[PDB]
Design a protein around this nucleic acid. Structure first.
Ligand SMILES: [Zn+2]
Length: 461
RNA sequence: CCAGGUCUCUCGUCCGG
RNA sequence: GCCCGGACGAGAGA
């Protein structure tokens, strides 16, 4: 992606939208019980912690575009992935306005608790004003579509979230692009049946994990994988996606029968944004805050990996690639070992910056022991070897527990961390509780015991 | 007094069949 | 007891 121009939106007709400047994150009752290095991200330029210019930092992600042409390997990747999706029999029809707004089998309603975006946000208009889940009233929405159309500008906000130390000093705050309610609805009418088919079929056919529940899905994954794992990280995945990758995406869409809506992807490519007193325009790339980005990113990952294997290994048989992506995250396999250092090499030629998995300094063999997906490791149950624990390391959980956005949520927050934590084993878990229970508020909390959780997990199969 | 996207999963609360 | 569903809130993950 690349910025094409900035300029006081006042000089191009667009309103000024100002985001809050204060973090909602505050130290927990557990802030000193557990160790941690993360702190709330920089939300403004006038932030003390900064050791470099903010706006330079937060926009520096738009690294340019290597390719624009879909070459022979990408094309073969497209044909192969599309053929896979074809086996699912994806309903290619538009989704009616009512289901695109209110949800259907495999697709959740629009989120009524979030912003309606432009221009409703300058009009003080809210999703709740327009939508009614009880009546599923489409009349008002239809009128707003008629009135304001689609392809509206996105509103840029900095994400209020925890960030490591260097990322706070370095101003590496992440940006949110608030999609318009009109565009979310139009995207869902166009692609809802695609979204639903993905959500209903996490696994190696979709090559997507959207819709999976790790506690159960972790047991299916090793069985789905071929003998030899491989994996790697991308640096700035979304930003490094060149136009060629979207064309390839539109090609997959045409092939599976959505050919008549591929213009939507184009719109996703040339986007206008409002940040405070300014307005910019980006050509290339796909705003994280648009409908479907999670699916599209995962689909592109599938293309990317097929492409690199074709380029790197002559005569590789894609039918024996088994991979599952969640956006840019991925666990992949092949009956014979594939070298991620060699894949990362070929990736350069497509504008992809690939590095060893899990921030390793070097590319090393990926094994069931070091492999991670969705931040969780894979560990067979001691008692029942076929049942696999998604193991999230405690470090992450300790970071989370040290902060709250509203202490009235402490119980739910800590309970939820517990459901993540216990997979580390009874000993690590019981220590977690002891530490929680080492302060009075922790002793007022109702927390599940290991054996209750373990039994619940066994029973869930 | 509010403000801050798209999704998935899960848990909790409340309410139902 | 066990299923199935809804509304709202939260957490994590991408
Ligand atoms: Zn433009």
């Amino acid at each position: 992606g690349e910025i094409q121009w900035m300029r006081p939106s006042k000089e191009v007709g667009y309103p000024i939208i100002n985001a809050p400047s204060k973090t909602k994150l505050e130290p927990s009752a557990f802030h000193y019980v557990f160790e941690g290095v993360k702190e709330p991200a920089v939300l403004t330029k006038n932030d003390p912690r900064l050791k470099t210019d903010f706006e330079e930092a937060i926009f520096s992600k738009y690294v340019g575009n290597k390719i624009t042409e879909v070459d022979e390997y990408m094309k073969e990747a497209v044909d192969h992935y599309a053929g896979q999706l074809m086996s699912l029999d994806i309903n290619t029809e538009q989704m009616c306005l009512e289901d695109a707004m209110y949800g259907t089998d495999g697709l959740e309603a629009l989120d009524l608790s979030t912003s309606a975006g432009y221009p409703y946000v300058a009009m003080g208009k809210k999703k709740r004003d327009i939508l009614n889940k009880q009546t599923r009233d489409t009349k008002e929405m239809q009128k707003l579509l008629d009135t304001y159309g689609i392809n509206l500008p996105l509103v840029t906000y900095v994400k209020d979230e925890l960030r490591s130390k260097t990322k706070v000093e370095q101003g590496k705050s992440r940006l949110i692009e608030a999609s318009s309610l009109n565009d979310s609805v139009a995207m869902r009418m166009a692609f809802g049946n695609l979204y639903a088919a993905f959500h209903k079929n996490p696994g190696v056919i979709t090559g997507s994990a959207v819709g999976c529940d790790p506690d159960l899905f972790w047991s299916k994954i090793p069985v789905l994988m071929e003998e030899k794992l491989f994996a790697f990280d991308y640096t700035g995945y979304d930003a490094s996606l060149s136009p060629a990758w979207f064309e390839a995406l539109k090609m997959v869409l045409e092939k599976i029968g959505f050919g008549d809506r591929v213009d939507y992807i184009d719109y996703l490519n040339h986007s206008h944004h409002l940040y405070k007193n300014k307005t910019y325009c980006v050509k290339g790339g796909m705003p994280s805050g648009c409908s479907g980005t999670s699916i599209f990113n995962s689909m592109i990952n599938n293309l990317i990996i097929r492409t690199l294997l074709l380029k790197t290994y002559k005569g590789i048989d894609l039918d024996h690639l088994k991979m599952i992506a969640y956006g840019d995250d991925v666990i992949a396999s092949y009956p014979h070992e594939v070298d991620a250092s060699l894949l990362a090499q070929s990736g350069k030629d497509y504008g992809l910056t690939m590095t060893p998995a899990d921030k390793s300094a070097t590319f090393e063999t990926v094994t069931w022991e070091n492999v991670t997906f969705l931040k969780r490791f894979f560990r067979a149950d001691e008692k029942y070897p076929f049942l696999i624990h998604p193991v999230m390391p405690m470090k992450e959980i300790h970071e989370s527990i040290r902060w709250t956005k509203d202490p009235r949520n402490t119980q739910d927050h800590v309970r939820s961390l517990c459901l993540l934590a216990w997979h580390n084993g009874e000993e690590e878990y019981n220590k977690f509780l002891a530490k929680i229970r080492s302060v009075p508020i922790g002793r007022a909390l109702d927390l599940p015991e290991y054996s209750t959780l373990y039994r619940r997990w066994l029973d869930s199969f």
